[PDB]
């Protein structure tokens, strides 16, 4: 935050869609980086869960200006929040105030030549620490169309490459999330149709022997541009009903089975939490079960 304040650095984060604001005050039970679960006591006060309002914090996605919007939590374990209290940070916010740049030791002097018109000089320490290392996200989008011979498939069978290019690709052409790619590694598994025309008649004759799809392809895969070298943080899945999504693909079949089962378990924890807490104050009015109620599960 700036060492000089004005009175407007705290209102931009709260008033805009920057700092997460709770809908109704409650008791915080757990805190994660991707979600902040809030146990709001809509019933009698118990550590058994309640009318859960889960809050999805947008973590690492792409904006228009090739940057990232971050939301880091600040509420610790066991802190009763108020309607209007801050819950997570913004892309530059410290707690609730706006903090764009930094505060460094400045010294006004013509150093030697370098600061001629509008140049800024700084020591070796500024790159030894990640004090100005920002996150730059670039989208590599490519739109799907059709072909004269007939449109496509999915496989990782890409000729004219090495082993390290197909090593970070799975059996289905999509690179993993979190792979150390660089200039040269294949992100996108495209190959290009030669057709009957580009082949010589000698391989028309031995492509009366090999296959309809045996030598129909040549390499023009979409790679990393020359000079940039980062990591993969987000992949995309877009498919259209007609033409038979691949299997084996064992890791795509495993992946959102594993993720989707957790997506069921968290949502049944939330709605189970929101209804069984609701009927507890209904059932206590007219009876009591001290030893019998905490043995059977919450469903």
């Amino acid at each position: 935050k700036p060492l000089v304040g004005t009175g407007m650095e705290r209102a931009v984060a709260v008033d805009s869609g920057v700092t997460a604001v709770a809908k109704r005050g409650g008791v915080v039970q757990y805190v994660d980086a991707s979600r902040i679960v809030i146990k709001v006591n809509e019933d009698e006060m118990y550590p058994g869960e309640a009318g859960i309002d889960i809050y999805n914090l947008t973590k690492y996605t792409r904006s228009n200006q090739n940057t990232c919007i971050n939301q880091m939590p600040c509420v610790s374990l066991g802190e009763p929040v108020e309607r209007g209290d801050v819950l997570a940070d913004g892309p530059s916010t410290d707690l609730g105030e706006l903090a764009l740049g930094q505060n460094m030791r400045v010294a006004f002097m013509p150093w030697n030549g370098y600061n001629f018109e509008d140049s800024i000089l700084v020591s070796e320490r500024v790159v030894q620490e990640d004090r100005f290392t920002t996150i730059h996200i670039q989208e590599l989008a490519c739109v799907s169309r059709d072909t004269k011979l007939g449109p496509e498939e999915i496989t990782a069978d890409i000729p004219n490459v090495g082993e390290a290019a197909l090593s970070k690709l799975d059996e289905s052409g999509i690179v993993y999330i979190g792979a150390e790619v660089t200039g040269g590694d294949i992100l996108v598994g495209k190959v290009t149709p030669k057709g009957e025309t580009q082949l010589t008649p000698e391989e028309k004759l031995l492509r009366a022997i090999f296959g309809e799809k045996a030598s129909d392809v040549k390499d023009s895969s979409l790679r990393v541009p020359n000079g940039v070298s980062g990591t993969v943080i987000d992949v995309q899945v877009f498919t259209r009903d007609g033409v038979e999504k691949d299997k084996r693909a064992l890791e795509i079949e495993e992946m959102q089975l594993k993720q989707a089962k957790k997506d069921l378990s968290e949502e049944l924890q939330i709605l189970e939490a929101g209804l069984f807490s609701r009927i507890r104050a209904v059932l206590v009015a007219g009876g009591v079960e001290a030893e019998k109620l905490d043995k059977l599960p919450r469903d």
């Binding site: 009175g7 407007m8 209102a11 931009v12 008033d15 805009s16």
Partner: protein, 43 residues
């Protein structure tokens, strides 16, 4: 014992900055009233 906030310049704010998105939220919300009735704009 009560004192002054003691900052640069004696201009005490009595009414803070309002909702900065009132250019957007009031014009669109009054324009197309999803939860309210039909009035002001499309209507």
């Amino acid at each position: 014992k009560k004192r002054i906030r003691k900052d640069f310049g004696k201009r005490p704010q009595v009414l803070d900055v309002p909702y900065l998105l009132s250019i957007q939220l009031d014009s669109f919300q009054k324009f197309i009233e999803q939860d309210p009735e039909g009035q002001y704009g499309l209507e």
